[PDB]
Structure formats: C-alpha cells, structure tokens
Design a binder for these strands. Sequence first.
RNA 1: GAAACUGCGAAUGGCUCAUUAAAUCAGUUAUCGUUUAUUUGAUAGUUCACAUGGUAUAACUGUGGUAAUUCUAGA
RNA 2: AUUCAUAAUAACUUUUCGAAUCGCAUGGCCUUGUGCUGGCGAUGGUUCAUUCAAAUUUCUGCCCUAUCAACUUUCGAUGGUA
Lengths: 59, 187, 71, 142
Amino acid sequence: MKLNISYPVNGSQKTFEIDDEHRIRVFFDKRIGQEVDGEAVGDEFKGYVFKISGGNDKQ
Amino acid sequence: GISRDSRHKRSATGAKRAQFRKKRKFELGRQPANTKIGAKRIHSVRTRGGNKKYRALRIETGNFSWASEGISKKTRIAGVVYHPSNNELVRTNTLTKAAIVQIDATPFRQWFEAHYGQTLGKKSKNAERKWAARAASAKIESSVESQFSAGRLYACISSRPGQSGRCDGYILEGEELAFYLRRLTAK
Amino acid sequence: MEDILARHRKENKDLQNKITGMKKQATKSKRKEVNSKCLDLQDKLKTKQENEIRDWKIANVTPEKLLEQLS
Amino acid sequence: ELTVQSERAFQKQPHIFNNPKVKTSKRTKRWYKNAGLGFKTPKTAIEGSYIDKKCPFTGLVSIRGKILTGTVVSTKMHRTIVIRRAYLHYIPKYNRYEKRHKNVPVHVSPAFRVQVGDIVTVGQCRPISKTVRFNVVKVSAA
RNA sequence: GAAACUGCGAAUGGCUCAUUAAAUCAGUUAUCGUUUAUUUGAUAGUUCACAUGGUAUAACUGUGGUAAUUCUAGA
RNA sequence: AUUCAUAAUAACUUUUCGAAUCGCAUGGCCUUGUGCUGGCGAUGGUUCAUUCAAAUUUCUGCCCUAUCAACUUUCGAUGGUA
C-alpha cells in the first residue's frame, strides 16, 4: 500500500511504496488521529512517530 | 409538511374537494413547542421574510406583573396546576398561554417591604416619609396575602412561549382569581 | 455529618471556579445571559445542600379555606 | 345565555382591568365602541354582562366592506344564525328572470335577539370561522 | 487582468394544457387580518487598541487516490 | 369605525441595531504637528412611509346528466370556549 507521509515543520511530503503486508498490518484497527510508532512499519522509519490523518481506499 | 390551507377540507355543503394544487410553502405549519419547566433552552426558527422566531423549551423563570401595584418582577415557576384547554397539558407540566401556575413570591414581598414597610404572613427618616406618604395602600386583599403566607402565588401566563420565547404572566386578583380557585378546588 | 459538609465545601469551591470561568469567558452580548445562569447555578445548590443536611437533621394553605375566607 | 362563566376559562375583555384596590361606580369596566355608518349601539350591549370576543360592539372585530340584508331561516346554533338572500338572475336569450337564493351564515351577538323570519342587516368582517364572514348589525323586524 | 473568496442573479423568461366544474377565472371589494429583497423619501450624540483589535480559509505550491462524474484527501 | 398612530410607567431578553468598509479632490486654521477641521460619491445599516409584489378575501356569474334524492359527522362535518 501507499503511505503519503508529510513533515509539517519542513512542509515536505512523499509517498512510500510499501509491501510486505505484516509491516502495514500494525496500522489496522486504528482510528484517524491516533498516533502510531515507526519501527513496527519499518526500521528505516525507526524513532519516528506518525499521526493518521486519513486516506483513500480502493475506488 | 403540516398544511394550513382550507382546500383540503370539505365544503360547507359537505362535498369533497379535489386535488387542485400541491402544498405551497406559504401555507405551512410547524410542530408544537411543548415547553416544559427547568433548565432553559430556546431555539431559533427562520420564518417568512427573515423575522427570527424563538421556540422556547423547558423555560425556568419569567417576568410576572402585579397589576394592582403596577409593578413586575422576575420570578421562577414552580408548576402548572390548571389549564382550561387540556388536563394532560397540566399533567406533563407544560407551559402555554393562559396556564394557571405557581410562582416563588419572594421578590414581591421584598418589594412590598421596601415600598410599604409591612410584613406578610405571620429605618431612616426617608423610609418613614415614604411609608407615611404611602398610607392606606397596604390593604391589598385577604386572598393574596394568605397566598403570600403560603409562599407561592397563582399567576396566569399571559405570553406565548412558542412564538415569543418568554414565559410572562400576571398575578391573579379578584373575580378571576376566585373563579380559577373554584375550578381547581373541584374534587 | 462532617463528610457531607466537606462535599459541600468541594461543591462551592467548584461553584466559584465555575463563576470565574464563565465570567471571564463571556462577551458583551453574552455576559447578560450567563449572569442569571450564574445565579441560577447558585440557586438550586443553595437549596440542595441544605435539604441534604436536613437529611442529616433527619438522621439525628388549602384552596378550601382560600375560598372560605371570602365567604 | 343564562350565565357568563359557563366555560372553563375566565371570560373577560382583553386589557380591560378593574382595580380591586379602588371602589367606584361602573361595576365592571365594560369597553365598547360604535361600529359607525350610522349603526346604533344597543343599550343592552352597554349594560350587558356577556363577553363575546367576536361582537361588533364589545369585541375585537371591525365592520368594513359589504352591507347586506337577509331573512333569518335558522337560529338554533350557539351565537350564530343562518340567513337567506333572494334575487332574480336574468337570462338574456329568453329575455326574462329566474329566482335564485344564497344561504349566508352570520354570527349573532347577545345584544340582539332574533327569531326565524326576522329581517336583519349585516356587515362584513374578518373570518370568524370556516364560513362566517359577516356580523349582524341591525335587526329590523319582529 | 485569468483564478478564487465575498455580494447579487439563477423564484424572471420560455414551454405545455395532464389535472381541475363554485375549483380556476371575469368584473367588483377588504386587510381596522398579514409578509414584503429591491427602489424612492425620511430616520440612531444615549453602547461589556480607537491615528483602529482577533482567527481561519479558498485561490496558490507540493504530495496523492480510483475505470469513471462540475469526485476529492493529506500537508 | 378601533385596545389606532403615538406617548409614559414596572420591568424582561439562548439581548437586535446604533459604520474597525471603499474610490476621486485634496482644501482652510494655526499653539508647524503627519496637529485640528474639511468636499463629492460608493457600499452597508434599525424603523416608518412609498413602489414592485404576495397571501387570504366580499358579491354575482360556469357545460351535460334524476337510468344520481338525499348528502355531510368512524378518525372534522357545522358552531362555541381555550
């Protein structure tokens, strides 16, 4: 799945192509606005924490 | 919605009318307020030409007038005890126009002590000059002073809480008072 | 009976916190509206604790004559 | 028409207040007005005890528009009568007339007392009820 | 001077005659029983920082979604 | 023709309004400072009146049928009070 991640301090943004479904499985059963830690979705984003702001599903 | 036109009723001769027109907007009606007591809540209704209208629900206090003294005080509402239109309208503690109701009666006797110096139930020279000037006027009637001893008065709601948003009334005096207690004493 | 009075002290310190809160948060159009509902927020509490300690004090005119006096 | 306080509400004229503090003449304050157009206020309207919100002399209505004349054909309603107006409709092909009539319901105050066959003159007011648009202003028969 | 915010207009016009028989409509009244943008003419010395006070947000930039709509998300 | 217009009292209000807006000309007074005053308009704004209206409404008038004579009121019909 695709992760549109934005840093508001620098104001930058980039989509990440993410595979290996058990990395994005930690996002499941979570609400918009709940924060999520970074190492569960990836050790490249280790130490980071993100806030879920929404998204788009299929169709 | 709720229609207000006379085209949907029968004729004077008794004949059915046919469907001549759809419901126009200028003949609309709206649902009743059914204003309870306690914990004030007024909503706004947008009406024809603008002209915002206040729909009152659960009003608590209101401005009541003593007509014989020519005064008016803001007093709270205890409860409705008689309604000429419906007895369920009494039973649900609803307030409409012309509802017989009980009021708290404390600021009225505060004003009576301040204006006349006599007590109900049972110091400076300016005050004595006022009280001697206001002689022969502490002889109101026996019914309202015995009500004052009881601590509540019977008042009639003279305002429409549905259209205006306020619950305003006036204190019962004389023949109308005696008629309403004759009506509510029937048991 | 003292714990009920301590709850009453908690009640009126929370009440003066309420009073200061929506006396500072009010605007010119809305100040005159809250003041009555400040006093109203006093009033039943000014009753309520009293009958509560009247429970602690419990712990330890008809319409007919109103017609008849006219005669 | 035997007592005044039969209904459940207190019948009284609106915004006409008799002071219980004072004690003077004119036992109840009775507001009245003259309807105009030369129509005489009856003496029992001044001296009466009925209230009748829709009365043209003691109530909150006004007389304007048409002035009609009729013969009372029904009177057993409560403060309402039904009159009949008769006229001739002209057919121009046969060059002659025919008899037609209309039934008008009209509100009657207790200031007047009418029976069947009385001739009354009425004046138009605002809608009193579903069908009543007129109010009787002068009775001229027996 | 594009775009966009704001304000108006979009309830006018145009078309058709299915419904509808005291209904519509014609001439004639009334509102002392009401609403009224717009014109037009009048009409506020009285008010819980005043050389003038606060906050978002579109347009814009950039990252995107689905086959597709005058679809829209996050920053 | 009015409990009308309007006024005055006691108050009342999930309190309405009473300009923090914009363009041209830039002028007069001096205790000469960005000091004080000052024009022609545009937009908005409370209420009244006017206009463009609207909604109800009075009277009278509609084609063929009795092989339609009684119709209306369950649960609105006709009127009164609220």
